[PDB]
Structure formats: C-alpha cells, structure tokens
Amino acid sequence: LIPIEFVLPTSTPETALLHVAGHGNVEQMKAQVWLRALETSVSADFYHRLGPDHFLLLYQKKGQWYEIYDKYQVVQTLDCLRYWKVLHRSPGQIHVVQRHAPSEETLAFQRQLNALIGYDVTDVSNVHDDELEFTRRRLVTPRMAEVAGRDPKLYAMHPWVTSKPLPEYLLKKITNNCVFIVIHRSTTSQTIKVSADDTPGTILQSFFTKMAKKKSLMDIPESQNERDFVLRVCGRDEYLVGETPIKNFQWVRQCLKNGEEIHLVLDTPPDPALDEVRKEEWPLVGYHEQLTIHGKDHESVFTVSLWDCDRKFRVKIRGIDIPVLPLTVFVEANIQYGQQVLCQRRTSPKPFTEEVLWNVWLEFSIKIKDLPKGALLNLQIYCGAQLLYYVNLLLIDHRFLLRHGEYVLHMWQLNADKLTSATNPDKENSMSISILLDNYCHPIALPKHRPTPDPEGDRVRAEMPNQLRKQLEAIIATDPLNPLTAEDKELLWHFRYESLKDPKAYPKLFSSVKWGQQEIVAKTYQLLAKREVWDQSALDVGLTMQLLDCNFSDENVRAIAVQKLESLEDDDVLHYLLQLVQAVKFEPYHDSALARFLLKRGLRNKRIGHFLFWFLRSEIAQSRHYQQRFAVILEAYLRGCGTAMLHDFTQQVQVIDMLQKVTIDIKSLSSQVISQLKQKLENLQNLNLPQSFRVPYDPGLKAGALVIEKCKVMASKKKPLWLEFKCADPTALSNETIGIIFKHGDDLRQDMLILQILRIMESIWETESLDLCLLPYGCISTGDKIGMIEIVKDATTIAKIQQEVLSHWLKEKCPIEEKFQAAVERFVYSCAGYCVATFVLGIGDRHNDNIMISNLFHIDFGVPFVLTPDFLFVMTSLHFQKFQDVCVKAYLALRHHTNLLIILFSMMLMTGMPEDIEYIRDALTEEDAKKYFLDQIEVCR
Amino acid sequence: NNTASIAQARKLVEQLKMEANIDRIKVSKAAADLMAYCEAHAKEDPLLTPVPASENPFREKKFF
Amino acid sequence: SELDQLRQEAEQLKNQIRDARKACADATLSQITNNIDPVGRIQMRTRRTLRGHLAKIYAMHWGTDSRLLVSASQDGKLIIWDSYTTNKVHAIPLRSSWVMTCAYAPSGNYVACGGLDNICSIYNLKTREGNVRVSRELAGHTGYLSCCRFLDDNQIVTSSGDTTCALWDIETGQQTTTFTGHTGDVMSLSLAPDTRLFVSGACDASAKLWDVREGMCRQTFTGHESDINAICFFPNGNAFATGSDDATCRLFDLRADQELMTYSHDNIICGITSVSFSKSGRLLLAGYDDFNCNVWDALKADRAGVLAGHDNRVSCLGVTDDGMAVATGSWDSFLKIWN
C-alpha cells in the first residue's frame, strides 16, 4: 500500500501515483506499476507495444543513480524506502526509465580490453548462474571510491617511498649525515651536497637559492620557479618528490649497497590530465527472526529459513552422457567445506557405456539446517577406483539461497585444481552429468548468524589451572603443520576465551571448530564479536598467511585476515603479491574481500598495478579452471587505471605477441636459420614493433630500437632468443644494451615463485643486519612454456669457464688487488647465501648447468648444495672461516622464521607445482641447529 | 558501579565474621589429639605395619 | 566512605583472625613429635598394574568394598576394575572424551564421572537390563566438572571450574545447595566421614571448610604459594592435607584453624598432583609430576619412602577403605596397586 509516485518513461512529463504493495518484494511493485501504466496512461499504446524488459527501475540516491538489479530483494533491503522515511519523502519516486542499446565507443573499448586480457569477460557460454556478471556489477562502487580517493600529481609521479630503518651495513657507507647528489641538466653536472635526511622540496629550494644567479649555466629558463621542476633518476623514470627523508628511496639504498654514484636530472611533472579515467555509465547496484515459517499463516509466507528445515539433504543423480568415451565404473558424491568431507555417499558398479542412468536418490546425513555457507558438492566418477573425472558445485549460492532444480554440469578431467567451482567450457566433448535438486514452493534463504552477548567469556575471568594452561600452551606452541587430534580440538574448543588473546594460536583455534553443526557456528560467530586483542595486536604477516590458506573457507576468518593485511605498506604488499594472487583461488565465491583488496591496492600504486596485471594475465592464459574469475578481476581493474597505463599495457602486449610469433616460427626447426631470424626481426621492425615499451620486469627500464647485429640463437636444449635492445632514454649515463632472453618450452611458474621467496629471504636477512648478496634476476611468465628473462651482463656460466681456473679468471678480470679482494668478498658472501638458501628450499642437488658468475647467482630453477673446490679456493682457513661464520649465522637467522618459511613452502607446493612437504621440517630442524648445519658443510667439503 | 562492589565487599565481611566467630583450640592440643589418634590406629593400618602376606589378597592368593 | 569503611573493617577482622590463630600457635607439631619414634622407610612394591587404558589416566576412586575402583582416562572410556583380579567389571565408553574425574559410589550401585562437558553424568551399573545406562545428566555448572563424590545412591557433591561447588539430588538432577565464596577454579574436594562437612581446594592457594547441611564457608585456610591440586580429610576428620603446585604439602587442623605442619624438601620442585592418607593417617601419600609419589610421615614430616612405578606423571592416587592397598594412576595410561 506504500504510495510511490513514479516518473513515467514518456509524457509535460506524466507521473503516476500508486499504492505499492510493500508487503511483498519488488516483483509485486513491478506488476502493479505495469498494470497502472497499461490502464491510466494516455500513451498506454506506447507501453503496450513494449514488453517488460524495455524499462528499468533507477532511483536517485544522493544525486547518482542506482539499479534495482534483483527483484528478489525485500522491501526493507530497498534502501530508498528508509532513505525517504528519514527524509520523510512520502510518496517516494522511482524513475521508470527506458532501456537503450550500447554505442560503438563502448564496444571498441570492450574489444580492446578483451584483447589485453586474452579472454572475453562478456562470455556467458560456460556459466550455470549469473555469479560472474553480478561480481562485475558489484566491483564498480569500490573502484569508483578507490579512484576518487587518489592524489593526481603524486600518483602520476608515483614516488617509490619507503619507511624501514636503514640497515647497519649501510650506515657505515653513510658518514657525516650527508650524501652527494650529482645533479644534471642538459649536460652540466652540478654536484651539490645535502644532508641524508632532507625532503626533496628542501633540496630543490636550496639548489634554487644557491644558483639563483647562475642557473643559466645549467641551461634552464630563468622564468621558472622551483615547483616548475621535480627531480628524476637518470636512465629510469622513478621520480623523487613528496615528503620523505632522501635516505628513504629504494634506489638510493641500492646505489649505496653496490657502492655507485648518485645521478639525478631535473624534469617536469607528468601532467595529471594524462591520467584521466573515462566516465562509466553503469549505475551502481536477513536474519532468522524475520525469515521463519513459525508464527505465520501459510497464506502470508514467502520465504523459508534454511534452519527451519530439519530434514536431511538428498540429491538425484539422473545419469551421465558423454559424446564418446575417451571396466567397472561408479560414482561418489561428497559434501565438502574447505578440504573437509562432512558426509560421503556413493553408488554401485555399472556398465561402462557412453551413457548410464539410475534416477537414484542419495541421502546425506547432514540436516538442511546444518549446512554451512560454502559447502561444496563434489561429484567423482571413479573407474576400475582410479579417479577419472570430477566436478564441483556450491549448494548455497552468492545471493544467499539454496540450489533447486535440474542442473547439467560438464566434468573436468584428471591441489587447488580440485576445488574449482566452474564448469568445463568444452561443451561438445566433455562428460555431462545431470542432476535435480528437489524444488520448493518457497526459496530457502539462509540468514547470517547474529552475534549476541556470550558471557562464558565475560564471567570466566580468573586464570585457569596452571596444569591445564601448561598442557594447552604446549600444544599451541607447535608447528603450523601441527595435526590437531580431536583431543586437542576439544581442549581448545572449551578454552575459547583463553586462546582469544593469543594471536599465535588462531590458525589452531579455528582448525578445531566443527562446521558440521549449527550451534557450533553460532558460538564461533559470537566468539569473533569481541576481538580487541587481535585488531590491536602485532601485525605479523607471517601469520595472516595461514588464515587465507586452503583449510579455511569461512566468510569472517578470511575477513579478519584481510583486515590485518589492510595495514601493510606498499613495499610489503609488493613482496608477497605473488601468493596473494595465488590466494584468491581458494576464495570460495568469485566476489570476496581479498579480491577487493587487490583491486583497491592496484589503483593507488603503479608498480603494484603493473605486476598485478602481469600475474593476472599469466594465470588467465594458464589457469583455465579460474580463468573466468581472474578475467573478471583484471577487467574490473583495467577500467580504473589511467589511459596512459592502458596504452603501455597495449604496447607491451603487442611486442610480446610479435616476439611469440617470431619464436614459434623459429623453433619450427644452420646459418640460414640465423639469417631468417634477422629477416623476421627486421620485418617486425618494419611491421611496427614499437621502440617504447616499459620492460615488464621493470616499470622504469625502457627498451628502445632493437640492435639487430647482436641477437642470436643459443645452442642449448630450448635454444631461446638472445635479444639485446637499446635503452630508449637519451639521458642514460651509459649505453649498455637492455638484454633479454626469450625461451619456449620451460615452465615459468616455478622460477617466478622461487625468486619471490629468495627476495623475501633477502629482506629478512637485511632486517637482521646482514648482506649475503643474492641476485634476483627479473623473470616473468607470459603464456604456456613461454617467458621473458632479464639479462645479467658481465656474466659467464661456471661450466663455460671450465670448458685454479676460476681464481685465475677472477684475478684477471680485476687488475687491482683492492678490486680483487672486494670481488673475492662479493663471492664469499654470495656463495654462502645461495648455499644456505638452496639447502632450505631443497633444490641444491643438480648438475652445474644453471649458474652464472657475474658475484654469484643461479639460473633455470628446475645434498644441501654444491660447494665445489674452486669456490672455496677462491674464498688453511681464514676466508673459509668468515664463510662458515656467515653461513651458520644466516642459517639461524632464518630458522627464527620457520613459521613463514613453512607457510610459503606449503602454499606454493599447493598452487604452483604440477611426504614431499616434510623435508622443510627436517631441513629447518641453537647449538643443535648449528651442529647439524655445520655437519652439512663439512660433508660437502 | 558501587552496588556490585559493595554487595561483594559485604559478603567478604559477613564471611570473615563467620570464620572469626569460632572457638579454636590450642595447637598443642590439636597435635596431641592427632598424635594419639595415629598412636591409637597404628596397629589397624597394614600400610604402616606390614601385615602377614597370608592376609594380603594381592600376594598370597589369586582366587578371590 | 561506605566502601572504604567496609574495606578497613575487612582488613581489621582479618588481623583479628590472624591474632586468634597466632594465640593458639603455642607449640609446633615437629616439637611435640620429636619424641615419637620415626616411621622409618616405607619400602613399597608394585603389586598390580592395570593395563587397558589407551591414553592418559585422569582420575580413579576406590569402592567401599576396597576391591573395585573406577578410573577415568583421556581415551573417552570409564572402566571399572577389580583390584584383586585386574578384570574390568565394566568398560563404559563415554560421550565426552575429556573426562577428568570419577567417583565410585559407596553403595556400589552407581558410578559418576565428568569433565569438560560441564555435566556430571551419573551411570548405573545395576540397571534393569544389566547394561551401563546413564541415570542422570547433572547440568547447571558453567565450567568443566573438576571432581565429585557420592554421598549416597541419590545424593552427590560435584566441583567445577565455575569457582563454586554444589550438592546435587540425583533424582531431581538439581543443585540442592550451592557453595559460593571461592575466588578460583575448584580443583578437588573430599567428604569427611561425617557427611555433613566437606573441604574443597582451589587455584587461589586456599581451602575452605563447607557446611553440607547449610551451605556456608566455616573456615578458610591459607599458606600455599600456588594452586591447591589435591586435598583430603584426615582419617579422624579433624585435619586435612593439601597438595599444591608450589611443590609443598601442608596439614591443616579445623579446630586450630591454622597450619600445623609442612611436608616438603629442597629437591622437590614440581607440583603435587594427588594426596591420600593411610587408614590411621600416619602416612601421607603424595603424587608428583616427576614420575614419583613420595611417602611422608604425617607426624614427623619425614619422607619415609617413594613410589616410583610409572614412566609418566602420577596424576592420581588412592587408598583402599581398609588401608590394605594403594592405587596410583598416571599419564602413562597405567594404574598401579601398591602394598
């Protein structure tokens, strides 16, 4: 009966005043408005011609427009009504607008985006529901707020600031609290000294004042003020402004660590107008007490809470039909909740035809009120039982309802692979299994648990028996791979306000909670209602990476994990971003909180944006299972960044594509092949292979016009392409060619991870005031078995130098004894580093075909390690002593983070690779650790 | 928050009045009493004085 | 005003109690007992071992027959043993795996147990069909059931982790009386031969004498520097000993309302898990968390002997009603009878 005056699509414009049947939901109002338009309207012929889908219901909230996308939403969920009541807008107004068709601008933009991604986002040919499209319509508002909350100038410049304390082994290099800025301009090299703790604004003001009467020498217009300029590295684009001590910029620290000069050049601010984002027209899109049958008459019933249903869950497996079979066979269905198997069911052997039928029922033990939000209905065709097929299906859906009706699903064939919740896109040669979920005259709408005062924690406040505490806190202080026996789960589930002030226990507390029931989950959602000893805890991000793993699928465990991660800083985010990407696979739905986190992160930084883009693209090109989800994420991202970033992505994609074409052509099969390489490369130069594409592993290092005489094809197995571009930046302080190797046939999902893990290890050692100088050479994966590898010049394979050798060679390369000793050191430090790191990562054992002595580093990541004679000889034992000491010291430094090493190792071996985890416990194993580690070294020696 | 603290503090003093309003006995007499009790029941305690193995059901016999 | 005057009245009545106790402290038990002959060395031998429990044993209790005894274990079962024959009169599997206590009824018909479930489940051995059926679920406690002792076939007292005790009527399944006053989790209790009084031990390092009839705290004893883990009445019923995590035992007399004796040694550093008196009371058998169970002279305070028959913590121990034998449970999943 609610009176709402509707703005009619057609006319002075005509408005219809109604009495909306607000008791029901939007469908009733739609029918009422339709009939009223049919009858009252003088132009009723217009709407009579038009069907129901030719008009949309949009309402003006605070000025903008919002869509009533779901008619299933109840009147209360219509925030317009409450908004009006607060504003007392009676009758309210909902604009009945007429639909329209897309324009060509939008279509071209969409084709561009789909070309970037490598996979259509508007594909609806492999989805059995509208989860994807609603994810897409929902990600808009977070992106609009993220973009509106950006600083134009600073983002354009994207200063790469930092806030970690300066390590000691660099504080020796720094003296007098000052550094030497080699200012450039045009060709003048004006050197001015400034204190190591000055903001760039101060430096610029000081330089302006000092040379306020000589700047014409520097070749700068006198008419310009200080703000008319901003510094910039030479040979890159990393701008240096903002508010930060000039000691806090990663490039300054790199220079200091490697002991090289600091060179800057004046520049101008990339104008904010170049960062415009094209406008978007897409308008922006209960509990158990209100949604229960009890206390109502059947004629006023529209919904039935999932908990009233005391019955048992049962499913109808009609049968299977495959176009062709690619023995005994039989099905097995399961319910699952994060690698858990709540209940199991199966059937009996059957003939192995191309199609089989039962129409049988399978009944589950778990009541329809005991189901958790996120259950997985696994369906496993075994054969004889050697698994041959699988597929999964959520039981509740994204919009808080239960699945009901006939479903036909296409099976995958045979990790994070088996938890996928999407249907095979092969609709014409995949095995299809149909099923029916019994229907319901009303929909089954699971509410969300209400947190209420839970006083078991409130008024159990004294301390517990020092016996029970002593047997509990010995269990809690175990490995994060600790098997929790039901004893342990019990002892902890009763002590559910003792381990609520011990963060180091959380992934052992919620590993016990039983998700098979309904009271357990209510209690556990009241447990998380008072978390004042978690939010304000210590932000240990080696822990939060266990609340976002396979074993956990809840909707608030991951929420608190992401709340912890929200407070990280940009560089910290960058260090682990590979796993955060790898940790959106397990998000049970498509839309989640980790995904919105990555979205919001990519729209206020640019290095994060770039690396996010490349990782999402690699997975979309590879992870067929989740490719739709990643594509949704990536496209929701690409509508927010600026036009210039879009163009840079486009150009990088073009270059990689052309190089892939040339590579695939080349590996089709002597010097004629080399000449054909030359011809193809020259033609590509002719075919608009551009000369300005920010090299993907380095958003600053631009590679210019190719240097053709330098390329070649190596004689190794894969025989990659040895490209040698030239820098496109004229101000470069040198002229070394930006090298790359381009290689086809070796999986680049391992070497991309391992490198992240060793980068983290380097960060840890740095935090522990050491420096073992490992070299992470930027590697990125572009497709399947295809990758672009950065080139480390000044290098030579160990094998080669052998085909006292290594020592002589070194003495030669360094005529001066001082440089020789600085080398021998940059060799000891690094050989130690690598030896320890590989003894930890369990890969040390392999022939010496992947090692490049620039310093020392390893390549081509396929006994503790290799410590061949030549290395030690390069290092009687004096340097050999400094070697052992640095080895053992680093070993224990790292054993103080075995929690983080184990979590990263496991989350890696579960999502990257194609009894195997235990080696990290034995390997990681103070005197005891030292003795064990020294034993390894002595054995290799 | 006075009505709770006061209602609690009253229970304390009403308890301490209970405990203090008791007629205790001299420690010397308490000891004498316990010593003469053990002295009285010392014979009837096989753990204190080992009794014959025959009277022990655990050692002498397996049938019970 | 009202609260500061009531706090100073509390803290004056407290020193009035301290002076009322110091007045009676005329002579020590070590002086009076200097004369009596030392008890010597109680050389004990392991007579029986009770195999069958699959995990830690948490509690045990002799029957009034001096032959049967219950024992609770982490394995989720409640077994009734025949000490003489080692045969299990019953092997009851439990609904809750975290059972912590058990108590053979004096009548022999019922046995009770409990733990983390916050319920004192009463079991019937002499059931209509002869099976092991649960007579009652004594619910109402807000914490784990820490200990309980049968008064009769229809009455049973239980302690819990809610910092209170309670008397139950098995028939109504209702807390007849509630013993409030403790400020800590109540680890143990012990009924006097006269069923009208019982003591209880708590983590506040103090014990309290309760009136079963009324339900009031009669006296409060202190002296332990740590949680009291075990407590029981002296055979006569005028004194009681307490075991604590402070690695020391103490004897308390009700009439003297103060500590009489301390039983401890510099070597002993771990807490006491259990205690029991001999039928006469001259011997105090204390269980320890170092695989040992030292025998003290109650009057001399000398360590007469040690019972070392377990590879793990000796969590619990008991004495037969006839004082004929000593049982000692342990975390090694084995009980042991001693003589």
Ligand SMILES: Nc1ncnc2c1ncn2[C@@H]1O[C@H](COP(=O)(O)OP(=O)(O)O)[C@@H](O)[C@H]1O
């Ligand atoms: N990141 C890199 N930078 C420069 N050169 C490299 C890099 N990685 C590998 N190489 C060169 O490639 C050669 C090894 O090729 P590789 O692909 O490892 O052969 P295979 O695939 O048979 O192991 C070495 O000679 C090495 O110098």
